[PDB]
Design a protein around this ligand. Structure first.
Ligand code: HEM
Length: 152
């Protein structure tokens, strides 16, 4: 549960991502795959990537980065009212992709890392707080649907 002030910060920060959604999306996925290599194994179409240079050179990875952040952005712009948007993602990730909630924690922190990396000194304490809460909300609502499905 975020305040309107906090949602304001979230969407303000998001304007940064929207100026270059492919570049952010790319770096988030790279941060995830290199921080936590077991995550790479869940992608049959990226599992071939061995090196970060290959990751950096992958237009399909950038493409998927765009799909992911486009989805996340759509969800964030709902300011918490994202049941319709979130339900199919929870379902596909639990039932088809089999993504444990731990990996959603991983990519949450990765987003935080990328924002600091791409905008050093421009991602303030208040901004980090709001973004972090927003990603926790996202994660928590997915976790509820995972529990429903009995998915571990
Ligand atoms: C902010 C978090 C995330 C968002 C918004 C997101 C969104 C999406 C979307 C929109 C798709 C394509 C449609 C679909 O299959 O539902 C997708 C596919 C997929 N996602 Fe996620 N995702 C997130 C996190 C993750 C994480 C953390 C993992 C694994 C570590 C993951 C693994 C996958 C895989 C394996 C696919 C299918 C890829 C393919 O074969 O095309 N996702 N995701």
């Amino acid at each position: 549960g975020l305040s309107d002030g906090e949602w304001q910060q979230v969407l303000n920060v998001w304007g940064k991502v929207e100026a270059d959604i492919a570049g952010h999306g790319q770096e988030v996925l790279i941060r995830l795959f290199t921080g936590h290599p077991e995550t790479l194994e869940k992608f049959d179409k990226f599992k071939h990537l061995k090196t970060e240079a290959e990751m950096k050179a992958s237009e399909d990875l950038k493409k998927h980065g765009t799909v992911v952040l486009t989805a996340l952005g759509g969800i964030l712009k709902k300011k918490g009212h994202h049941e319709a948007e979130l339900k199919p993602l929870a379902q596909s990730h639990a039932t088809k992709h089999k993504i444990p909630i731990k990996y959603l924690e991983f990519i949450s922190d990765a987003i935080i890392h990328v924002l600091h990396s791409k905008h050093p000194g421009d991602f303030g304490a208040d901004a980090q707080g709001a973004m972090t809460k927003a990603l926790e909300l996202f994660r928590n609502d997915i976790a509820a649907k995972y529990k429903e499905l009995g998915f571990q």
